[PDB]
Amino acid sequence: NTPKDQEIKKLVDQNFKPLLEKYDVPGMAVGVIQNNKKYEMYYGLQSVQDKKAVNSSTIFELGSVSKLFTATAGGYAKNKGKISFDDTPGKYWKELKNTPIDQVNLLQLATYTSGNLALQFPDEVKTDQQVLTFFKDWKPKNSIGEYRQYSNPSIGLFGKVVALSMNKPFDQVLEKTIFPALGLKHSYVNVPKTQMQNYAFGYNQENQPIRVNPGPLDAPAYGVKSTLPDMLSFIHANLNPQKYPADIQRAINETHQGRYQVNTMYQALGWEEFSYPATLQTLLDSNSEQIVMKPNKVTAISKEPSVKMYHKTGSTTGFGTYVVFIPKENIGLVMLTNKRIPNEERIKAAYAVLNAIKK
Ligand SMILES: *[B@@-]1(O)O[C@H](CNS(=O)(=O)c2ccc(Cl)cc2)c2ccccc21
Ligand SMILES: [Cl-]
Ligand code: NA
C-alpha cells in the first residue's frame, strides 16, 4: 500500500475501470511495471458461471500479442545461426522449395510484405494438407516486399519455419525454450489440464463463455495464453534485456529493430515501434482500419528514432490484450480482458495512465 501502489490504483480506476461498464466486460487485469516493480490490478470474474474472480493466476488469451513471442522465437533462432532473415521458407519447409512463395524471404514473411497474404487464411483452409497446398499454390500479387498487409498466415509461416529450423514443433519452441528463457511460469500454447481451472472463459456479445478454436497456423499467429504476472515479466525483459542470458537477450533486442516505416509507425518484429514521446493520435493511427486491414506501401528507414516506444494490440473472439513499453522511462503496461473492447479504447486508457504517472 505504498504511495505508488495507491497512485497506480487510482490511475487504473480512473481510466480502465469505466470500460468494464461501458463494454459489459466481465473481467480484466491491468498491470504497470515501473522501476522494475510490478503493480497488478484485478477486476471482475474470470468465469461468470463459477463466480471465480480474476486474479494473478488467471490465464487469458493474448490473440495477436502472441506474434510478439513468435518474433522473439525468430530473433532467438536468428542469433543462434539457425536461420538468416534473408533465407526463404523452402530452405526449411522443403515441400515449398521451387514454388513462388520460396521467392519471399523470412523477414518479409515476419513483417507482412509478401504482397499476397491477407489478414486470415481462407475459411476453407483448415487441415495441415490444406495449409501446405495453400502455400504451394500461392502466387505473387503485389510487388514482393513493397506492401505491408497485416497477416496471420504470413507470420504464421514465419513461425513454422522458425520451428523447423529448431527441429521442434512451434508449441515446444515456446514452451520448452522461449518461455523458460524469459522466466515465464504460466504461459502456454496449450493450457495443461492442471491449469484449466485458471483459464478464463472469454465472453462474446451474448455473454456466452467461449475460447479460441483451432485454426491453421494458430499457434504462431494468435495462440498464446498467459497471466498478468507473466506478461509483466515479458515487459520487464523487453525493458531490461541486458539482465537476461545472451541467447534470449539478443532475441529480445532483435525484435526491437525497426525494419521499415509506414507513416509514423515503424514495423519491428512483432512489435510496432514509434518515436517517443509519441502523440496519442500516432498510437491510434497505428490501429486504424487503413493500417490494420489494407495494404500500405512501405518506406525504407532513413533514421530510426533514437528514443522509442513499442506496443501491440491482440484479440481473440473472447479476449482483448494490449501491451506497451517505453525503455527510456523504464515503464510498461499490460491490459487483459475476457471480452473484446475497441482497440482505440485500450490505447487511450493506457496513454492516460502512462502519461499521468509520476516518473
Ligand atoms: B490479432 O489480434 O490481430 C488481428 C486483427 N484483430 S481484429 O480484432 O480482427 C481487428 C483489429 C483492428 C482492426 Cl482496425 C480490425 C480488426 C487478428 C485476427 C485474427 C486473430 C487474431 C488477431
Ligand atoms: Cl487486435
Ligand atoms: Na488465420
Helix, strand, coil shares of the chain, percent, nearest 5, are 40, 20, 40
Hey, what's the cell of 293? 486491414
**Determination technique used:** X-ray
Hey, what's the cell of 318? 473472447
CB 273 within 8 A of CB 310: yes
3-state secondary structure 2-40: CHHHHHHHHHHHHHCHHHHHHHCCCEEEEEEEECCEEEE
Other beta carbons within 10 angstroms of residue 123's beta carbon come to 6
CB 153 within 8 A of CB 218: no
The alpha-helical segments, DSSP class H, found in the chain are 3-15, 17-23, 66-79, 106-110, 128-136, 152-165, 170-172, 179-181, 218-222, 228-239, 246-256, 280-285, 289-293, 343-356
Residues 6+ positions from 349 with CB-CB distance below 8 Å: 15, 16, 19, 335
Could you tell me if residue 322 is left (phi over 0), alpha (psi between -120 and 50 degrees) or otherwise beta? beta
CB 322 within 8 A of CB 335: yes
| DSSP per-residue string spanning 190-206 | S--GGGGGGBPPEE-TT
Distance of alpha carbon 196 from alpha carbon 191, whole angstroms:
7
Distance of alpha carbon 65 from alpha carbon 321, whole angstroms:
7
Distance of alpha carbon 59 from alpha carbon 93, whole angstroms:
33
Distance of alpha carbon 200 from alpha carbon 339, whole angstroms:
10
CB 85 within 8 A of CB 109: no
Distance of alpha carbon 219 from alpha carbon 269, whole angstroms:
17
Instruction: Label the pairing between strands 260-262 and 37-47.
Output: unpaired
The CA 42 to ligand 1 mean position distance, Å, reads: 24
Q: Is 76 a catalytic residue?
A: no
Residue written as cell 515449398?
A: 96
Distance of alpha carbon 260 from alpha carbon 239, whole angstroms:
22
| Ligand 1 pocket at CB < 6 A | 63-64, 119, 152, 222, 287, 289, 292-293, 314-315, 343
Q: Is 57 a catalytic residue?
A: no
The CA 74 to ligand 3 mean position distance, Å, reads: 19
Domains and CATH numbers, the chain: 3-67+172-356 (3.40.710.10), 73-165 (1.20.58)
Helix (H), strand (E) at residue 309: strand 308-315
Measured in angstroms, the resolution is: 1.6
Could you tell me if residue 191 is left (phi over 0), alpha (psi between -120 and 50 degrees) or otherwise beta? beta
The CA 121 to ligand 3 mean position distance, Å, reads: 4
CA distances from 219 to 32, 68, 113, 175, 352 (A): 27, 12, 20, 11, 32
Query: Which residue's CA is the nearest one to ligand 1's atom 3?
Result: 64
CA end-to-end distance (rounded Å), the chain: 18
